[PDB]
Amino acid sequence: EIKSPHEQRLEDNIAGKEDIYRESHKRVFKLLERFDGQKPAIDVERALYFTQSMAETVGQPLVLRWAKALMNVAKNITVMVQDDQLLLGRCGGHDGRYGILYPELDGDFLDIAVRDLPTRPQSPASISPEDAKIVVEQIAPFWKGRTYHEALNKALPAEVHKLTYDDPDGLISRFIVNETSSFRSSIQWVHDYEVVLKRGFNGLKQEMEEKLAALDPASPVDQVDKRPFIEATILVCDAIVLWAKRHADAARKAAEACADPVRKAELIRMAENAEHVPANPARDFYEAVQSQYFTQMFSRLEQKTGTTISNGRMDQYFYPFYKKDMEAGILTDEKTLEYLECMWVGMAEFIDMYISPAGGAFNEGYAHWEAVTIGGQTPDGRDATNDLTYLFLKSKREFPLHYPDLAARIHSRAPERYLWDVAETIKFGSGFPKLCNDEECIPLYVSKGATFEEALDYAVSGCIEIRMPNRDTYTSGGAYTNFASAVEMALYDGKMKKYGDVQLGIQTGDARKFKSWDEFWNAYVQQHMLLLRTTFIQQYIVIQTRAKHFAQPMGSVLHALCRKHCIDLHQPQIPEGLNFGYFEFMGLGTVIDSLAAIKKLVFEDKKLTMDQLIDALEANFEGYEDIQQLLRTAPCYGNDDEYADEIGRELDRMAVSFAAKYGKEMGINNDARYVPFTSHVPFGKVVSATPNGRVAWFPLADGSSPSHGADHNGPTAILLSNHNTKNYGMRARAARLINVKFTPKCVEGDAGTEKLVQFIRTWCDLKLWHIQFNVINADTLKKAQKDPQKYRNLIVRIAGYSAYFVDLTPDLQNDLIARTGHDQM
Numbered sequence: 099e100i101k102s103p104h105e106q107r108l109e110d111n112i113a114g115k116e117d118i119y120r121e122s123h124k125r126v127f128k129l130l131e132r133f134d135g136q137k138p139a140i141d142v143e144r145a146l147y148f149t150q151s152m153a154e155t156v157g158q159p160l161v162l163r164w165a166k167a168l169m170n171v172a173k174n175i176t177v178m179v180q181d182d183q184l185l186l187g188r189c190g191g192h193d194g195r196y197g198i199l200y201p202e203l204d205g206d207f208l209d210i211a212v213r214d215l216p217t218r219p220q221s222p223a224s225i226s227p228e229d230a231k232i233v234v235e236q237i238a239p240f241w242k243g244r245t246y247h248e249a250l251n252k253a254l255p256a257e258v259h260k261l262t263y264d265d266p267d268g269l270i271s272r273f274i275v276n277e278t279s280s281f282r283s284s285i286q287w288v289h290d291y292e293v294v295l296k297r298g299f300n301g302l303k304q305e306m307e308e309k310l311a312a313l314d315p316a317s318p319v320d321q322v323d324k325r326p327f328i329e330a331t332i333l334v335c336d337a338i339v340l341w342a343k344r345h346a347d348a349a350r351k352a353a354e355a356c357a358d359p360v361r362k363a364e365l366i367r368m369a370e371n372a373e374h375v376p377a378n379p380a381r382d383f384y385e386a387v388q389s390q391y392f393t394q395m396f397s398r399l400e401q402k403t404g405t406t407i408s409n410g411r412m413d414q415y416f417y418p419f420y421k422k423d424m425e426a427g428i429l430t431d432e433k434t435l436e437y438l439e440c441m442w443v444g445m446a447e448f449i450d451m452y453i454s455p456a457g458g459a460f461n462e463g464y465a466h467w468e469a470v471t472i473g474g475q476t477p478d479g480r481d482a483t484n485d486l487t488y489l490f491l492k493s494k495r496e497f498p499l500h501y502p503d504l505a506a507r508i509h510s511r512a513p514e515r516y517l518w519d520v521a522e523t524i525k526f527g528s529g530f531p532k533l534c535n536d537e538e539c540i541p542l543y544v545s546k547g548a549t550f551e552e553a554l555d556y557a558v559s560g561c562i563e564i565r566m567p568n569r570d571t572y573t574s575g576g577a578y579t580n581f582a583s584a585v586e587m588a589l590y591d592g593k594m595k596k597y598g599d600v601q602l603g604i605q606t607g608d609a610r611k612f613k614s615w616d617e618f619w620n621a622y623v624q625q626h627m628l629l630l631r632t633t634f635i636q637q638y639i640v641i642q643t644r645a646k647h648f649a650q651p652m653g654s655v656l657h658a659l660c661r662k663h664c665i666d667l668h669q670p671q672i673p674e675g676l677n678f679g680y681f682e683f684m685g686l687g688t689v690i691d692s693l694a695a696i697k698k699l700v701f702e703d704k705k706l707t708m709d710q711l712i713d714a715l716e717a718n719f720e721g722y723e724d725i726q727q728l729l730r731t732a733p734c735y736g737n738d739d740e741y742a743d744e745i746g747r748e749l750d751r752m753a754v755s756f757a758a759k760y761g762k763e764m765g766i767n768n769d770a771r772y773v774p775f776t777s778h779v780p781f782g783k784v785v786s787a788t789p790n791g792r793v794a795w796f797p798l799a800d801g802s803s804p805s806h807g808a809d810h811n812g813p814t815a816i817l818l819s820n821h822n823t824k825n826y827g828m829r830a831r832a833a834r835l836i837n838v839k840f841t842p843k844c845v846e847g848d849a850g851t852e853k854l855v856q857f858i859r860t861w862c863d864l865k866l867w868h869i870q871f872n873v874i875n876a877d878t879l880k881k882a883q884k885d886p887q888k889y890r891n892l893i894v895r896i897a898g899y900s901a902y903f904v905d906l907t908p909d910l911q912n913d914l915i916a917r918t919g920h921d922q923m
Contacts, residue, residue, distance in 0.1 A: 126442070168338075274594075287565065290567040309328050334655060400650060410565075411557050463902060470504050470505065508862050521845075561833070572678055654666050677766035683750075718786070736803070801897065814860065
């Protein structure tokens with residue numbers, strides 16, 4: 099057993115050695131050492147001043163109410179300068195790690211959060227007694243009966259509601275057909291940050307002022323629909339500029355108070371940055387970073403974007419500034435890294451807080467996906483690797499936090515040097531970068547109306563989604579659907595052991611009496627299709643309800659189509675826009691292996707009856723351990739085994755075929771996707787023992803990865819099984835998340851790096867959308883479990899993101915531990 103660089107850095111931590119890269123990243127190491135190990139605090143300032151303005155503007159158009167509320171935040175929120183920081187911009191008054199509150203989304207959870215957040219098993223957070231008082235006395239009262247979650251809970255018909263929530267108020271999910279619009283303002287998103295760098299918000303404001311002056315004063319559409327949108331974007335331009343200007347004043351005040359002449363000069367430079375950007379076009383690399391940073395941070399104040407607002411193709415839109423400053427002799431590669439890593443530290447201090455229980459369970463370990471995209475192709479079809487591409491990879495290797503959410507684009511002509519550096523970065527052993535395959539998503543997107551130019555220029559967004567920031571217009575959170583519960587409902591006449599005698603699914607009969615595979619298969623299909631009908635019905639209601647509760651004036655002004663047609667992003671239909679939505683197929687590996695065990699062992703080979711099987715399941719395999727071992731011999735997904743994989747291909751076909759038929763009457767693509775967040779942990783907690791040998795309440799298979807320990811034929815067979823369970827003749831599909839784990843010995847040395855490169859090129863050829871890797875020894879995870887304080891800095895890749903292992907619940911830790919660690923390729 100050899101150790102990954104990450105495991106060696108952990109050993110150095112335990113010994114007390116200074117990190118080997120600390121001396122070349124000294125400023126940002128001093129920065130991150132100040133908030134290491136602290137539980138984040140809830141900050142109420144954004145929520146307070148947002149609510150105070152919204153309470154005064156009831157009746158006015160929502161997009162204009164939003165811009166007025168953001169101006170009230172900009173004028174009143176605490177502004178500060180952090181010691182040794184080179185960047186300005188923060189979303190609260192708290193030092194260290196902090197999250198903020200969005201009462202417009204889930205304000206009906208504020209009393210629960212005030213009591214239960216500091217001790218929650220997933221991602222806890224503290225709140226001071228004074229801030230708790232402000233929450234329950236000044237923020238929560240106005241939002242009673244006005245939150246999006248309250249409106250969604252009341253809008254769902256009873257038959258849908260019973261598969262969505264366990265209680266009449268919607269405070270507890272059943273994790274069957276799980277709505278996700280209630281614990282984030284929208285799905286993932288990427289702003290067009292380059293238009294800010296090239297024109298500033300003054301340029302955008304001027305463009306919108308020209309549209310205001312061109313309105314027909316007699317046109318009711320111009321005056322009632324377009325004017326409040328236009329006035330909202332103009333006001334939000336002023337709001338972010340004022341907010342930046344307040345940061346400039348704070349830096350000047352800190353400069354005068356500081357006797358150190360060097361730090362005094364830095365503070366003045368920072369004050370001058372904030373006085374120029376994001377109002378005006380950036381003039382160098384330092385201004386470009388500060389301008390982008392102001393925009394993404396102010397975005398957090400605007401709304402709780404799913405996975406936290408993503409950052410786009412930073413190695414492309416920052417490159418002209420980097421190249422000019424390098425050639426002029428005013429920038430170095432080390433100073434470039436220092437600017438970027440100050441941005442990472444600031445993003446690491448902002449925690450995207452989910453205050454509801456389902457929100458917390460979906461986002462273990464303070465989960466975040468502020469996707470930063472590098473590599474790929476230019477809008478005119480050339481490779482886009484540049485010097486910045488390699489600096490981002492270098493930063494992720496040496497900067498010790500699991501920030502940023504680095505995502506590398508792969509295409510069939512990606513340079514050898516680029517793929518080699520990507521493979522070596524993966525071998526550092528913290529999960530970075532995740533890979534997105536141009537060859538899979540670009541033909542899907544041009545088929546669905548995108549031009550090649552805008553498809554080639556896509557940014558990674560969130561987990562592994564893609565965005566065209568001036569063409570994408572769909573923002574509604576999708577359903578997460580538990581198809582493992584369909585297996586259980588097919589066994590127990592549409593009931594689930596977790597919920598006892600609640601009639602959840604179709605009454606498909608006593609599975610003990612089933613006499614053929616055709617009979618049990620027909621029973622599963624009826625529950626499978628019920629989950630699909632429920633999924634799309636739920637989504638249609640979500641789309642209509644979100645349009646009455648959310649607005650995004652700054653994000654809209656950064657969108658060319660919203661500027662052209664003068665309509666806010668969260669409306670269901672924007673002219674010329676393309677709408678890419680999703681529903682989640684959760685538990686694919688669990689469903690395939692369960693159905694294959696029944697088909698093979700019960701009906702084909704007749705090694706046991708339905709009665710013996712269900713006896714073992716209801717006993718949770720207690721007293722039936724020989725049966726549990728037998729069930730684990732059936733064909734399983736992730737082994738290139740056609741017996742299992744054709745079942746999974748039919749499962750996928752049903753979902754995609756349904757998506758193809760019923761998306762269009764909702765006016766969107768609502769495509770089948772296999773990206774789990776950490777929802778496979780609570781989805782597993784509600785599913786009892788399954789015919790694949792999985793014990794009750796154990797996590798489901800993650801993403802489209804094989805079930806834990808079911809992949810016995812090497813890592814490449816995982817890729818082949820993924821291909822074999824897809825339907826490339828149809829298009830109503832989106833990403834699949836693949837988690838693969840190697841040991842460090844498996845990819846040791848340059849020979850191991852070359853093996854990983856070829857693994858990636860095979861993955862690319864197969865048109866698989868996503869892949870990411872853990873490179874870790876099994877003993878590291880077990881030692882971290884036994885002594886969490888000694889291994890508190892252990893970072894592992896979970897689901898599109900990495901987190902500290904000790905921050906994960908035991909269930910999610912068991913998921914990571916039970917994933918097969920491949921010792922050879």
